[PDB]
Amino acid sequence: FSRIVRDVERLIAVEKYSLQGVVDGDKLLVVGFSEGSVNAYLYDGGETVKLNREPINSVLDPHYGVGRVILVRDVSKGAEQHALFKVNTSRPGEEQRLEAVKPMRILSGVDTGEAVVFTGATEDRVALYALDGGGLRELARLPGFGFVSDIRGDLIAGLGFFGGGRVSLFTSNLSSGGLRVFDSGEGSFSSASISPGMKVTAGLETAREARLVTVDPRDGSVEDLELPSKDFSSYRPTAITWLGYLPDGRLAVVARREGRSAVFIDGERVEAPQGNHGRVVLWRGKLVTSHTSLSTPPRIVSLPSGEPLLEGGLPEDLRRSIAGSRLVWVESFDGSRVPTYVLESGRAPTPGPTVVLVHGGPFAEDSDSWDTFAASLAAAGFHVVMPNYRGSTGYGEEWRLKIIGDPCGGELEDVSAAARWARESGLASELYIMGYSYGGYMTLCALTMKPGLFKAGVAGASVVDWEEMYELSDAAFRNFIEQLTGGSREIMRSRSPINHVDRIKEPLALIHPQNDSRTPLKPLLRLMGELLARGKTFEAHIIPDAGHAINTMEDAVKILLPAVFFLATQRER
Amino acid sequence: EFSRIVRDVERLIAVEKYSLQGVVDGDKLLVVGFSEGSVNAYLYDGGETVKLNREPINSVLDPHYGVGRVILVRDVSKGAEQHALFKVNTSRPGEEQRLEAVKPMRILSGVDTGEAVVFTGATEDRVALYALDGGGLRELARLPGFGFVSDIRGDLIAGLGFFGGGRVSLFTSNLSSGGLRVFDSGEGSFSSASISPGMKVTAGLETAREARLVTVDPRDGSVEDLELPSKDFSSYRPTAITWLGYLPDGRLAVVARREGRSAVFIDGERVEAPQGNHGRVVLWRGKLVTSHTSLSTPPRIVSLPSGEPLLEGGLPEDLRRSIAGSRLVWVESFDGSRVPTYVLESGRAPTPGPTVVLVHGGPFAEDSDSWDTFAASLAAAGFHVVMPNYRGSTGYGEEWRLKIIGDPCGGELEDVSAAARWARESGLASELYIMGYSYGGYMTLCALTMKPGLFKAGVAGASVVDWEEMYELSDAAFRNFIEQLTGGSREIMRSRSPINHVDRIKEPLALIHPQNDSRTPLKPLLRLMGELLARGKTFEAHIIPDAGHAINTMEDAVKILLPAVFFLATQRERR
């Protein structure tokens, strides 16, 4: 229906904001999907001032008060070969490309105002780079995906996915480069910030709980960090989203459990709107973070009031289309409880058409956080089931690392268990699977390995063939695929759904951005080739000049709309 | 913006469209309607319609006057056009009997005498003429290429055959004992046929730049000119004959045309008809009835000479207003030839305004003053539409039509290109797009490969991509038809295939393709996508499930059209 498209359009079009920091003296730096695209803005109590010209993907983390912003922009029509552009915050809309940085996959970065330190992947390497007045320097080659978390003085701290799905802390020196990696035997570092003492405060996520530790970069000694207020440790977080020192020396921590987060300043709980929060900044002496929930598009709020600085208003009709949300614990094949977010649509009966909407990553989670796809499905009259299959973040190290070496195994059982739950709990009169990226991989895996479980499947930006994808991947993705698959060619082959096409029996909608460089299109063309040759029912939608990271409202429509149409169409059968 | 396009495309698709097939059930019109979202078949008594079929159909066989049944043609292969025949007794609507003696095949045409169901169909190994009577199925003749049953009277079958060089032969067979006689005119092509009571075949003969009627005797191949009592037909100077047929009273109805509009003639005498195009004419309740269409009027059944509608879909007022007007223009092409080009002006676009060269399929087809949903949706979306009858087109004589032979992606593309440049130079077009389905999509691919920079973007639906692979995958009819279009030249098949010039593409391209297309198969389209990808080309693709070349549902029409209009509307926001 045209009503579908209008709702899909409006959900996409609602402005969404993330908090990046404080720049231009004491002005908020936010990135907003607004006015049709992702842009950087200054906010200082009134109207936003747009910093960039053309759409961007992100900005680098500014040190407090810096008079510039580094835009990260895709210059490869979606393939995520990014260049960096600086904007002097005094002169909004004037851009200077940082030409010493050849286009690469920029993974992360920080701008101190005097040096831009970033990680990026090329075909041959992941590396940590510093660009300052003397030009560009490779500080270190990283084993895999690596992210700069912080710079204080000469010390750079970061997080590395350098093996086994485990996250290491790494440090380097701005002046001299080099690399020190710190692994924990208990889990993975999730967050880091260098203290005034020049040690690294980090979130350590273990099997069950998460805690703060202090890593001394000189010897690798680790000790628990105890905070003045005990609200934080008595909250017993399973995950630590974010931490940072504020300008006044207080330590802000955002930690979470069961898909909802809480904010702590020197260990003391700060009231915040229910859902999930990102970074906390001090702006004009006051606390500010971003907030999201299943019914709240990412917005910037003041704490503790929850009062919005920057909020794209979810229209009340779209809000009403989500009649309810539960967190349930699906019983899986091996007795694992799969924490599963559920939206009941106010536009479906119960039992009703239900989509198991599978998250990407796999190191991500369905949480009490805004999900445009899920909202659009609920607007479209589908209940939504969003299972945190093993591999997911947010439920501890053991749950997340279970997926390692076992793609299309236990995690798909969790997805299937969620389908089973949806029917047996009485929610679903019929079941569909939909997912993007690792989610689309899961759609494909479900239709090949679990024919008959779903009525139909939507597979967006999907993993189709680990082997071919690997061979087309840059250094970061190659390493990531190695970790996920265990290195084994058996696993890479046997867990690729393009090798199990014969088993497909349900309608399949393929959606894929043409210049996706994470989940490349080439394997997907071969999949369509196989689907065609084997007489399989399928549709496909290839979106032009776009990649994995959707940064315009029209691209988001192009990749979401066909999914919703497909499922609406299937529902008339 | 997108939601308004969905609403306009949906409702333009959804408006009821009718084609007159004949008279059956004694004295009721048989009508194939696109209504309630699909192609169905109906009896029309004068009041309400009775739906004959159950599930959607592709067509019905031409009924002998008054026969008490209908034969439905239905794709039983999810779009690949392996059709089965189903008989419905007109006294028992909605009750279908599959004719099991006829294995699924591409049914090309057919007639039902009441005693025999006579049809042509294409399989892998042949195009044949068949007769199914109470004794069972008989293959009457193998045809050299695409052939169509035009008429039957007693044991004489007359038909038209594309049996070489893009020329149309007349053929006859014997209903009882088969065989084949082929009648070729060195002056042109036979275009319609009907057997007179004197058991002679009356036939439209389309010569170089004009069209006339001739009588063919099937016994001795004698051809003489048919001279009618009234000279209105002669004086009309038709360039083509749409259809002819003897009515039950022996009078000869002819629908002939000039410059994309037709005229109705009974025994040579003008019967006034609503402006545009008409189909077959029947007698019913002592009154003439035909189908009528125009660029602004969805196919409808009307009575002649009053022009009053009997069955018509009503367009919403907002969408009628989106068509500002239509005109025929003659665009000078590369050799001084004049390309007859219908121009549909959008009342939702400025002048100059965004303009789509909507290229017709076939290639033996034409852009006439006839309803075109694609064009209408384009007008609705704020695009002017330019619709060039490139050489290869029907409607303008044999010579113009046959010029395409041996020359796909040659002169016809220059004609399309000449219409494009005319739309800019005349001041109609502020920017230019190309869009086409089937041979039209081929033309899109050819324009973008051979004429980079001409258009801002192209939409290629159900497109020919590669003559060579397509030939590898075609049935007997399509192999032959590719042979004809390319002249039997391997060099033409390769060099005129856009798959081999992908390097040259500089403009965004949208590909729309039904997955089960057995005419313009998807396989070469996948290869084109692999080429586009490998060569860094911007493209969009939309593959339609469980559908093929012939769209018989609303939802499938939406799936092929909607992305085209989205794509073009999105391109218009661009530079």
Swiss-Prot record, chain A:
GO cellular component terms, A-Z: cytoplasm
Tell me where in or outside the cell this protein is found: Cytoplasm
Q: Which GO terms describe its molecular function?
A: omega peptidase activity; serine-type endopeptidase activity
Alphabetically ordered keywords of this record: Cytoplasm, Hydrolase
Q: Which residues form the active site?
A: S437, D516, H548
Q: What is its EC number?
A: 3.4.19.1
The biological process GO terms on file are: proteolysis
KW Transcription (keyword) present: no
InterPro entries reported in the protein's UniProt record: AB_hydrolase_fold, APH-like_N, Peptidase_S9_cat
Give the main localization category: cytoplasm
Q: Does the keyword Cytoplasm apply?
A: yes
Recorded catalytic activity of this chain's protein: Cleavage of an N-acetyl or N-formyl amino acid from the N-terminus of a polypeptide
Protein's job: This enzyme catalyzes the hydrolysis of the N-terminal peptide bond of an N-acetylated peptide to generate an N-acetylated amino acid and a peptide with a free N-terminus.
Q: What protein family is recorded?
A: Belongs to the peptidase S9C family.
Q: What is this protein called?
A: Acylamino-acid-releasing enzyme
Species annotation: Aeropyrum pernix (strain ATCC 700893 / DSM 11879 / JCM 9820 / NBRC 100138 / K1)
